[PDB]
Symmetry: D3
Subunit: 307 residues, 6 copies
């Protein structure tokens, strides 16, 4: 049996279920199954509960923000980040001040819910005491900020600004695994492998469009010659070119050719312009679930961390 922890509430939870639904890995009850991965069982927990059960051995995998992983995991050696950047849950844990200064003789208050990571940053380049408090309004009320910043709007609303070097950590959602489970529970390691591969291929896919265009041409080679002259019509390896038939004088002839290329989403609009310039029409654009390519070093780095 293989157990994977997922966030139970917050946007991290809805974004995680949205991620799984986009991978075609769909999951009142709190325990579910992902049937497309053999013997994989999902447990919905708060992220701190994912870290706690991963350390104890009740879970084998988890998806958690890097902030929760580093504070509640404490840099414990048992935890290994398999994928460090699932590209959601973007934030940074940092300190905010109003818009070395010697006023402290042990007799500087920072309000934070991160009871642990504040103290650690004081050994690196730091007289600091921590509290727990509307957290964002704490400097104005006199409680004491060290908090998560994403868009930074909360900082501007409370007349608070950010410092150079004030970012203690950059955080995304991450796929993490238990070391005791990967070495000791047979069957876990291969599904963490499959999970990493699927997440990489989905992230690449997310990503691209497949673009298919009708083009008038005499040969497949002339048409490909036209597509490859265009800078952003390169595709992964080049246009797939196939014949397109239509009835002329009661007889059929391949007057058109259909090309298919991958196009990055950010490049789509200008690509369309380019395709119109070389005579393409009826341009079908569609999304992808996965794009599998050559494996990234992430698997080998995981094995290097394991031995």
């Amino acid at each position: 049996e293989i157990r994977l922890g997922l966030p139970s509430k917050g946007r991290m939870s809805s974004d995680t279920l949205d991620l799984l639904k986009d991978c075609q890995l769909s999951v009142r009850q709190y325990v579910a199954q992902i049937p497309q991965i053999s013997n994989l069982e999902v447990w919905f927990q708060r992220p701190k509960d994912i870290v706690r059960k991963l350390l104890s051995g009740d879970l084998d995998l988890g998806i958690v923000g890097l902030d929760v992983l580093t504070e509640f995991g404490q840099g414990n050696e048992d935890l290994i980040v398999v994928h460090e950047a699932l590209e959601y849950g973007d934030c940074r844990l940092s300190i905010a001040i109003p818009q070395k200064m010697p006023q402290w003789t042990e007799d500087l208050r920072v309000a934070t819910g991160f009871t642990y990571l504040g103290p650690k940053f004081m050994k690196d380049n730091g007289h600091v005491a921590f509290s727990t408090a509307a957290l964002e309004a704490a400097p104005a009320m006199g409680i004491a900020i060290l908090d998560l910043v994403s868009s930074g709007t909360t900082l501007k609303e409370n007349n608070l600004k950010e410092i150079e070097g004030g970012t203690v950590l950059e955080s995304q959602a991450a796929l993490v695994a238990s070391r005791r489970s990967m070495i000791g529970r047979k069957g876990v390691l291969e599904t963490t492998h499959e999970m990493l591969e699927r997440l990489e291929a989905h992230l690449r896919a997310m990503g691209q469009f497949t673009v298919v265009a009708n083009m008038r041409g005499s040969s497949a080679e002339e048409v490909a010659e036209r597509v490859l002259s265009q800078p952003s019509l390169a595709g992964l390896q080049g246009p797939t070119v196939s014949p397109v038939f239509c009835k002329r004088d009661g007889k059929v002839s391949a007057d058109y050719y259909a090309i298919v290329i991958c196009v990055p989403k950010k490049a789509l609009y200008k690509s369309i312009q380019q395709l119109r310039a070389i005579g393409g029409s009826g341009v079908l654009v569609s999304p992808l679930t996965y794009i599998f390519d050559e494996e990234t070093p992430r698997w080998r780095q995981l094995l290097s961390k394991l031995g």
Copy 2:
């Protein structure tokens, strides 16, 4: 109005089904949105403001917005026919309704089946006018000053607008009709010529913003083409079929004999190989065509008649083709 601002602002409905359908349209365009102000990353430097629809029209006129998506009813009532508002796309194919006049089927309106015979009723004079309950304070007076009805007072009715004729608050109603079931439940009928306006959700733009603010026209162009290609796609199916044949050309002749297997320009035909007696040969060919969704079932039958099997059907985000006159007409309105 005149504010140094790097970003193009697009107003979207904040509450109602227009909000949910608008966010649904953007998600179907793969235009994911990032409080009350968000960003659309895919369109360069495009920033979305969620507002009440009247506030979208008001802020477009005041200059706080550059584009908006709003129903044509909200646009015509609150814009009041101002020439600065240009509909860029007049038919986003959701929010369909019509603002019209409904009158009772009973009482004195039994044989009042046209707006004209509603007019010539000696019941209403300067003292006791024709009471019409509506939330459309501007458009009612306009519709009947355009059609010559002398003595009409308009009111906003307490609670259930449709029940006002039954309660005695008003003699008729001026309201939005979609399926018409609300009218039928209260013994109300429309009339010939009673339709004040036909409405859909529309992409609207400010003339002053497009002319004066850098980048507005290009992102309006991108949004219009994206909306047109997405509507075209929603639209069609991609249909891919395996067919046994000796050559690609024979297979193509077979699919083209069929009326609704034409596709956009014709079938794409490619070889399909399989192992026979340890040797492979292109015993099959796979064809690809676009099929309109309303033709899908019939197309499947036709594909079976010519030997097709394993017919894959899948949807499209966009279909980009030749640009519609909507762009050229917008530039015509701008000079």
Copy 3:
């Protein structure tokens, strides 16, 4: 009277959301004009109008003729239809709403060494005085099941609150309830018995025979409905997989793909040329292949595709896969014959 085809759908419950999700996955989205109102449209099918009802009301209205089609669990069809021959199951297994209506008895006590329905019947505790008490919501199917299996002294009741708690509270001796995973039964120290299953149930497409033979348009939209649901189930199902591969000709690449066990596709790989510029000349150095891959096979197929030099492997889902018609249509027409 009327010229629209009416399709009944469950209004509340998990059956309702799963049904609307099935229709959206078919690109048959429902045009909820009023979300307070109970009637919507499916524009992709001509004159097809959806009515949101309680499932019992779907069966009642199919029998009365106010609906023509319905999607309902087989348990509800059996309990509220009572085997009326006018209700015909068109598609018997839409693969959601899986459960079984069965008998559960305590694990402990009097029922320790009772594990068959016959051994439940044999117990002597049950006479006209003091019968076997069964708590159930299935007012019709319980008595029929128990009169058919020779269990002679049984009284049935509806229970307050948690049906599964009725035997512990003393309200009842056994229950007749729906079992899916069976965890509710385990949580309440209950067990099924051999022969205790009254019926196996899924969501199903049902039609009125009077509507199909007598009302214009019903039989063809039932045909399209059956064909679309079957094709969608097949699609759910597969992935289309497209890979770039280096090769000199289409035949060499095809032989490489077919040498691999699970890269067979439905009929074999489609192989087309992929052109790329080398030294200012364009040439088909690569070829793109497309195959269907079953989803449970996806990962291994990827490995197989990498072994033969594949790259840039696009994976995407399908709304439909239409193939040869299943006998379900011919079976329907035979049921209509007379």
Copy 4:
């Protein structure tokens, strides 16, 4: 039957959902009979102020079913529900027939306009040539039982019934039915849909009622005494609901002079007369009974007028406060219950 089950508790069924539920819980709170909802998800709570009294929250239809089977002993339910689901069973005894909430009438409504414009009477509706065995009068209603009974009684033969989809009142406008049989309270739903009531169209007048099972009352230990207490408490609560206690300071020489003053006033009579007591205050360091306080019950509808009268005779500092119960002589209801029991 649940008439044989051994249980120490006396069981009172209360409506689980609806306006009847909240109004019933309001009635209990106004009687200081607060229900200790042990679990809100659970359906059973306790009323600790009455010995061995346990409340079950049920559908009203389930309250009637359970009273007939003997699984409940008392219930509070509208008389419409009692007539529909009890069907006039002789075992159901109405102990209190008018709890003065849930007021409505089940009646027949037909369109104001159409063929029914001159139809104001019920047998005007009967002497109508439109309905035969071929095409009957369609009536939408949720009352599967009471409709047939009412119209077999009033000389109308050719009638069909439907449990209409959704908005019952909109059934005649949609063409689902030609009339409706429904509950009317203020009648605004009838006016909103251009429908009207009829002479003789009223099927029954209904309020919330305290009902009991006769087999339970005679056979189950403790039931009769707690229905006695409930009826008494309810009667008193209604009387209190009702009155104000009014207390006034008055300048006077003796209690009898003050009493003479209050009793000259028409609405200062009280239940039996003003209670009069001395009110002392320090003048120049000595206390003396310069004032007197009077206590009277005043009906709420008289309060304002009573105040004016109390000022005319020199009253001030008029304290007005409400009452939980007013117990007086028993009404005939209890004896009537015993006559129905034998």
Copy 5:
């Protein structure tokens, strides 16, 4: 034939208003909760309409009575002589509309650069009343145009202040006005519609008596004593045990050695709620026990000048 009184539909004003009527034993008979008309049956022909406060002012300007914030009355009422506030202080919804600035050493509005160009930008919801304060206070350089408290960070403010904590999260003379909930009536009904004047009279009397009561406690104590006058002297020796006019003193009997005698006396006084606790201490000091404390719906006393002031406004 009908007298109509408007009440707020949503907000704390709504729950506080229905709580006010609920405390007055004028229960509101909401026959349809979805509908907007209810009745007060204890006052003959008194009908309640639930709507937003601007709508209440709108209909009083077009209703016979309304209960609305003084802010809504002054902004939407236009200072019209037809709207007469009969009771100006129902003691709920209390607040002040005032100006807050981030602007450090500026503490008076006069110190509040601002010209034709760059006119003092205040984001504010007071479409009518905003102009009034500065058109009257001599800053001619002001323009008016969400999540208001962050407006100084986002790009001074004129808003409602109650406890002021919302202001603290983000001046002298900045107060535009002080507001409470008020019972207002239209002159058109009072001079012209029969029965409006009389039910406004009853409403004003009930509201004044309830406000007095809200207010006090009735306190009843057992005290051992020989005579009523002795016990009364003991109660009156204590400063805040005076009551309205003095303690009501009555005999309390108990069985001693098989014979009954008035060994105790019960006193009744009104005690203000704010004074209750020390009143209990004082009552214990003079030998009281079993002190029953209970609330009041109304305390009617002599009419306030408000009715005669209203009639002076009516002539």
Copy 6:
């Protein structure tokens, strides 16, 4: 650092609503600004809403001065800390008991007391008695006192009561109120299995009451208001009209009756009514307190002695001679 008294109250659950209902009925109304609050009825008193566990902890840390919490939370999380003093141990809501439940079937059939669970031998150092519980601290302390050491405790996932049926645990340690959960899950209490009796309680910190000026007197005020209200909740005031010749005759009648005793005896005053144009005190009104549980029987008794028009009404407070809860608190404080 801070200057005004802080009172912790439960934030969520029925404990929260029942607590706010009690305080509002005690005239300690909480003025919630928006979701920290204030109680203005006690001069200068400030409320903090927290999770029950947090209140105890914050009392221990110094951040709180008072709290209202169930005694189970107090004993489980306070760990018997001497800084926490219960001021009122029984606010008469949140009633429950923390106790041990075991199955009725199987091994445990003929086991109906704690000592018989002890003299059961299924449990060894290797395979101990598995008890599912949320009380990480309290449970072990209870069983070393009169049970075995062959006990392991666990936190059950999900439904604690279903843990013995699922095989997770052999017994549970849980809160019992009405006992329906245990009966629904075929579980049973044992004699001597009760670990603790719990109600909601008013708790205070010793450091705050002795050391922070103003804390002790506002706990005095809230303790007296809470005790007073509880006493009143409690009683009825009952007032009856009685025909009689003298007040003493009427008093003798009420006192001849067992349960009409009142607190000290009936108050008796004259009731006047018009006879022949003359007024005379033909009646007398008596006032007594009646415990609510006795009300109905007292009514019968009042009728037996000729009473009529019996007014019954409730009380907010009943203050008497000072309760020993204050004197005992001061004894625990060293005055």
